[PDB]
């Protein structure tokens, strides 16, 4: 009769479909920062992205 599992901050980590009772894991979609690698502009202007 269990339905889902919560983490610390009321963040659900499971779900059961109302039609077909199945266990489904859930994870957040990716995010992060973007940085630019740049040599001295007195030498060149070619960069890289991380």
């Amino acid at each position: 009769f269990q339905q889902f599992g919560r983490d610390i901050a009321d963040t659900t980590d499971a779900v059961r479909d109302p039609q077909t009772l199945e266990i489904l894991d859930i994870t957040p979609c990716s995010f992060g920062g973007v940085s630019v690698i740049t040599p001295g502009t007195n030498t060149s202007n070619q960069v890289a992205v991380l």
Partner: peptide, 23 residues
């Protein structure tokens, strides 16, 4: 596998994303 002293190994053995990350 990692070039550690026995004392270092013992030391390392004893010590045990909601918008925020770790680096």
């Amino acid at each position: 596998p990692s070039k550690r002293s026995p004392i270092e190994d013992l030391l390392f053995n004893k010590v045990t994303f909601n918008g925020l990350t770790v680096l």
